């Protein structure tokens, strides 16, 4: 009976217009809002041939149906058929094989040429998270081309539209190079999205606190600190930047310095994040050269060993501890008695509660230069900071074997 009612009283779905899928509401659902390319989709279902042998189910609420819309991971009828239906809506569709199996079938389950009917009920769908720390959702409204990608560098042309809690602040065409969308008004989380779109791409990108303009928040478009932005993308066309192995040396040289100073600018304006972008290609061009002339060398060494001098700045201003003792260890593994190399490992040790090898490293800068003030008042923070983190532990560790052991008692 199910089967004749749609096959009746069916809206039909397709492009061609050729009766390929029918659908009948069975339940209405809510919200307005349907699912887009790329969102995960959760989904119940049954699947019945013209007979009304059932050959697959996923009912059960033991685990939904989970999987990525308009992207060839179901059958054609299915990327069609969901993405017209409202969340918590149940329908029916008769699905012809050529938007289903085919000729082919999928033996022994489907036969040869089968028009299938399926019962779907819409249980959630989320949009995709690009780096899986929920502060990139996308949305793809329509599909690009191509065989590459922007990379950090390339040059894009895009039209970008944005709104800060409905309010559209942003509508423009804007050419701006990946990294560096600050010179122009864009917020990081632009830059980073860029990287995984395709030349004709169009997308919704909903950017969370830590991908906007952050604490600082944005005067001239009236945006307020961390605030939650919503844009639209539209990536009309973009040139790549030349891979490290592509580059000669002389180029990397010339191209050293003009990154540092543009790194600098960056710094001096409190762009801690845009400073490391543009350091970090200094490192990317010239860590794993060799086969330089004398002249290349010299000149290649000393652009390195400041660019890992600087990040390691960068790092303790943007409080990543562990990315500024890194830096350290580079800076010092080219010279071994570099005295702002082992202060800011020491810094960042200090800061991290690792007081031995903080207090090893403050010694090693007076080693290099007794004359330094600051160094000795540190060792002594050391010190400090030490007695008073073993007091603290010494009460928590008390404090929970008295709550435990109170607790224990309570249970005999």
């Given at each position: 009976?199910p089967?004749?009612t749609?096959a009746?009283?069916?809206?039909d779905?397709?492009?061609?217009k050729?009766?390929?899928?029918?659908?009948?509401?069975?339940?209405?659902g809510?919200?307005e809002?349907?699912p887009?390319i790329?969102?995960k989709?959760?989904?119940?279902?049954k699947g019945?041939?013209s007979?009304?042998?059932?050959?697959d189910s996923?009912?059960?609420?033991?685990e939904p149906?989970?999987?990525?819309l308009?992207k060839?991971?179901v059958?054609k009828a299915?990327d069609?058929?969901?993405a017209?239906?409202?969340?918590?809506?149940?329908?029916?569709?008769?699905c012809?094989p050529?938007?289903?199996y085919?000729?082919?079938?999928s033996?022994?389950?489907?036969?040869?040429?089968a028009?299938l009917f399926?019962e779907?009920?819409?249980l959630?769908?989320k949009?995709?998270?690009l780096?899986e720390?929920?502060?990139?959702?996308?949305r793809?409204?329509?599909?690009?081309?191509?065989?590459?990608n922007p990379?950090e560098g390339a040059?894009?042309?895009?039209?970008?539209?944005?709104?800060?809690?409905?309010r559209?602040?942003?509508?423009?065409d804007?050419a701006?190079?990946?990294?560096?969308?600050?010179?122009?008004?864009?917020?990081?989380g632009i830059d980073?999205?860029?990287?995984?779109?395709?030349?004709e791409?169009?997308?919704?990108?909903?950017?969370?606190?830590?991908?906007?303009?952050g604490?600082?928040?944005?005067?001239?478009?009236?945006?307020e600190?961390?605030?939650?932005?919503?844009?639209?993308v539209?990536?009309?066309?973009?040139?790549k930047?030349?891979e490290?192995?592509?580059?000669?040396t002389?180029?990397?040289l010339?191209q050293?310095?003009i990154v540092?100073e543009?790194?600098?600018?960056?710094?001096?304006?409190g762009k801690?994040?845009?400073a490391?972008?543009?350091?970090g290609?200094?490192?990317?061009?010239?860590?794993?050269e060799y086969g330089l002339?004398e002249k290349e060398?010299?000149?290649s060494?000393?652009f390195?060993?400041?660019?890992?001098?600087?990040?390691?700045?960068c790092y303790?201003k943007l409080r990543?501890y562990?990315?500024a003792?890194?830096c350290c260890?580079?800076?010092?593994?080219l010279?071994?008695a570099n005295?702002?190399?082992?202060?800011?490992?020491?810094?960042?040790?200090?800061?991290?509660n690792?007081?031995?090898?903080?207090?090893?490293?403050?010694?090693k800068?007076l080693?290099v230069?007794?004359?330094n003030?600051?160094?000795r008042?540190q060792?002594?923070?050391c010190?400090?900071?030490?007695k008073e983190?073993?007091?603290?532990?010494?009460?928590?560790?008390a404090?929970?074997?008295?709550?435990?052991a109170?607790?224990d008692?309570?249970?005999?």
């Amino acid at each position: 009976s199910p089967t004749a009612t749609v096959a009746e009283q069916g809206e039909d779905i397709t492009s061609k217009k050729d009766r390929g899928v029918l659908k009948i509401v069975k339940r209405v659902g809510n919200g307005e809002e349907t699912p887009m390319i790329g969102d995960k989709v959760y989904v119940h279902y049954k699947g019945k041939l013209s007979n009304g042998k059932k050959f697959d189910s996923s009912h059960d609420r033991n685990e939904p149906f989970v999987f990525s819309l308009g992207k060839g991971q179901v059958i054609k009828a299915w990327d069609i058929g969901v993405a017209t239906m409202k969340k918590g809506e149940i329908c029916h569709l008769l699905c012809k094989p050529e938007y289903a199996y085919g000729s082919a079938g999928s033996l022994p389950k489907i036969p040869s040429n089968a028009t299938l009917f399926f019962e779907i009920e819409l249980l959630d769908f989320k949009g995709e998270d690009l780096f899986e720390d929920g502060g990139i959702i996308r949305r793809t409204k329509r599909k690009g081309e191509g065989y590459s990608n922007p990379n950090e560098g390339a040059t894009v042309e895009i039209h970008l539209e944005g709104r800060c809690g409905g309010r559209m602040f942003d509508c423009r065409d804007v050419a701006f190079t990946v990294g560096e969308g600050e010179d122009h008004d864009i917020p990081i989380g632009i830059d980073k999205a860029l990287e995984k779109m395709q030349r004709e791409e169009q997308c919704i990108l909903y950017l969370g606190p830590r991908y906007g303009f952050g604490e600082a928040g944005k005067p001239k478009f009236g945006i307020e600190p961390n605030a939650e932005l919503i844009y639209e993308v539209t990536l009309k066309s973009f040139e790549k930047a030349k891979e490290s192995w592509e580059m000669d040396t002389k180029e990397k040289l010339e191209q050293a310095a003009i990154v540092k100073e543009k790194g600098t600018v960056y710094f001096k304006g409190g762009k801690y994040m845009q400073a490391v972008i543009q350091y970090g290609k200094i490192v990317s061009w010239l860590e794993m050269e060799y086969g330089l002339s004398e002249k290349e060398s010299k000149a290649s060494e000393s652009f390195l060993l400041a660019a890992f001098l600087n990040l390691a700045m960068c790092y303790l201003k943007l409080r990543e501890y562990t990315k500024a003792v890194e830096c350290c260890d580079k800076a010092l593994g080219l010279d071994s008695a570099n005295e702002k190399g082992l202060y800011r490992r020491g810094e960042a040790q200090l800061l991290m509660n690792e007081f031995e090898s903080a207090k090893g490293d403050f010694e090693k800068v007076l080693e290099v230069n007794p004359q330094n003030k600051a160094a000795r008042l540190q060792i002594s923070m050391c010190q400090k900071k030490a007695k008073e983190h073993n007091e603290r532990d010494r009460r928590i560790y008390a404090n929970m074997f008295k709550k435990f052991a109170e607790q224990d008692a309570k249970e005999e």
